[PDB]
Design a binder for this molecule. Structure first.
Ligand SMILES: [Fe+3]
Length: 274
């Protein structure tokens, strides 16, 4: 066992999933730090250094990292793989990014199985000497992810179907909302420039009042202020922060992809009184 195979990922969700597949035979690191906004992140010379010293670079694609393709052109002789191949996308419904794929495919545990398979295939292709470890680790991790779905689905099924409105800040939850039968309301369709402008807040306030939706949420890499303004002006309580674009730090409450899915579903369910 000389040097560990080095994988660099764009952001922390892919880092944790890939590290579960790498296990003992590769080290995986994320370019963005926990809590950093990932869509419009601005890479630094230090990020170039980290990617250039990797053996493999993984990214989401589906229009998540607006920075990645320009950044990767600086990187020489380091293979990359997009980890969302074979996932059917949901289009963004409104705004200047209307009609392109919603990048947040990982919030569906069924989709996470495809992420696992795509990351396995890339490690097996570019570090073939450890293919058996990658294959074993991916099989074990896919088992955990697969088993993850049933308790989540049952938990959220307790909410009456006609009351299943998921009101958030970024429209980051489209894939989870589809899986578990939630209607989707958000203050902005995808992180970009306009985030909490009028018209956006007003439309959400109208849908809240018309349907008497009981809770609204923010997310861990963006500002909670638009969501708290919406709850102050309506009957809805502020449900707290969901995790979608970043894990927490390793010593925080959301250190892993599994903990992120569980925490986000629990926080939603609590916002509806379980
Ligand atoms: Fe996002």
């Amino acid at each position: 066992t000389a040097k560990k195979f080095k994988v660099v990922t764009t952001f922390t969700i892919i880092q944790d999933i890939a590290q579960n597949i790498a296990g003992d035979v590769a080290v995986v690191e994320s370019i963005t730090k926990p809590g950093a906004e990932i869509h419009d992140y601005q890479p630094t010379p230090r990020d170039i250094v980290k990617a250039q010293s990797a053996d493999l670079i993984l990214w989401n694609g589906m229009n998540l990292e607006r920075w990645f393709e320009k950044f990767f052109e600086s990187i020489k002789d380091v293979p990359s793989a997009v980890v969302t191949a074979g996932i059917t996308p949901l289009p963004i419904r409104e705004g200047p990014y209307s009609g392109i794929a919603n990048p947040h495919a990982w919030m569906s545990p069924s989709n996470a199985l495809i992420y696992i398979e795509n990351i396995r295939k890339a490690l097996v292709e570019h570090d073939p000497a450890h293919a058996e470890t990658y294959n074993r680790n991916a099989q074990a991790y896919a088992e955990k992810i697969k088993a993850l779905d049933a308790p989540l689905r049952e938990r959220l099924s307790r909410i009456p179907a006609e009351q299943r409105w998921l009101v958030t800040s970024e429209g980051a939850f489209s894939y989870l909302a589809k899986d578990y039968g939630f209607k989707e309301v958000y203050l902005w369709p995808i992180n970009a420039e306009q985030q909490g402008i009028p018209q956006q807040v007003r439309h959400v306030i109208d849908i809240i009042r018309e349907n008497k939706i009981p809770v609204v949420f923010s997310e861990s890499t963006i500002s909670d202020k638009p969501a708290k303004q919406v709850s102050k002006e309506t009957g809805a309580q502020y449900g707290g922060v969901l995790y979608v674009d970043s894990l927490s730090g390793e010593k925080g409450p959301v250190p892993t992809y599994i903990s992120l899915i569980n925490m986000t579903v629990d926080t939603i369910a609590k916002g509806f009184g379980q």
